[PDB]
Amino acid sequence: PLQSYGFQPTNGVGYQPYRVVVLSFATVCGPKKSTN
Amino acid sequence: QAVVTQESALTTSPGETVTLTCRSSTGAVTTSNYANWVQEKPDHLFTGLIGGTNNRAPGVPARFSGSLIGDKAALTITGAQTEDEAIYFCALWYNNHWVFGGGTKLTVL
Amino acid sequence: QVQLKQSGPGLVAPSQSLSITCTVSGFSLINYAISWVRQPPGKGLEWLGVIWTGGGTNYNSALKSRLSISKDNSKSQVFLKMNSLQTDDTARYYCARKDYYGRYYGMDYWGQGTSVTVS
């Protein structure tokens, strides 16, 4: 029940895979902007 | 930078799904250039299949399923015995104007 | 019911002018835009031009500037004009409805078609 798609440098951009990273959303806080 | 093409050849037995790809001159097509799929009946009847490079048209059955499957625009129809005998055109929005595809003849069984 | 109508004699000899009209029901020219497509015998469809919803015309770049398209907001009529024909211009012409406001941004409906023949 496992299907493998072969990837090689010869394989085109469409055939070749592109890595996908998905981020899902208090501790993780954005930087606090500080002026002078 | 204006070539639009289709395989112009399609034949799917019922029960198996097929993908037909329309390829532009800019390589992989982005949704920014909107992709459209239209179907031609042999009686000069036209209808809209896919819009927005991912969105199916209103009133066309969900069995019609078109996405950016490949690098270029593509369309997928599940096999049907009778109603799929028609021509299909791919459309891409260049910045200035619209380009329409060549047309693909589907002949089921 | 939403519907597109277009009418005209069609039969033209070379080098004179004939115009085609598209008449619409079920929608307003304010909520939609109208695009025209052309179908020569046995060849693929090509895009002619578009009228914007609230004024402003566009035409195919390669298509001659020696032509004009026109419309009626109140009575919902649209007119396409060709001021000089040549034998390559014989084709079937179609009017079409474009909804760039709507979620279905592409053309929604198309005209019922008119035959235009040279000689």
Curated annotation (Swiss-Prot), chain A:
Species classification: Viruses, Riboviria, Orthornavirae, Pisuviricota, Pisoniviricetes
Residue range from the parent sequence: 491 to 532 of 1273
Known function: Attaches the virion to the cell membrane by interacting with host receptor, initiating the infection. The major receptor is host ACE2. When S2/S2' has been cleaved, binding to the receptor triggers direct fusion at the cell membrane. When S2/S2' has not been cleaved, binding to the receptor results in internalization of the virus by endocytosis using host TFRC and GRM2 and leading to fusion of the virion membrane with the host endosomal membrane. Alternatively, may use NRP1/NRP2 and integrin as entry receptors.
Impact when changing residue 8 to R: In strain: Omicron/BA.1, Omicron/BA.2, Omicron/BA.2.12.1, Omicron/BA.2.75, Omicron/BA.4, Omicron/BA.5, Omicron/BQ.1.1, Omicron/XBB.1.5, Omicron/EG.5.1
Description of how the protein assembles with itself and partners: Binds to host ACE2. RBD also interacts with the N-linked glycan on 'Asn-90' of ACE2. Cleavage of S generates a polybasic C-terminal sequence on S1 that binds to host Neuropilin-1 (NRP1) and Neuropilin-2 (NRP2) receptors. Interacts with host integrin alpha-5/beta-1 (ITGA5:ITGB1) and with ACE2 in complex with integrin alpha-5/beta-1 (ITGA5:ITGB1). May interact via cytoplasmic c-terminus with M protein. May interact (via N-terminus) with host bilirubin and biliverdin, thereby preventing antibody binding to the SARS-CoV-2 spike NTD via an allosteric mechanism.
Protein name, as recorded: Spike protein S1
Effect of residue 11 to Y: Increased binding affinity to human ACE2
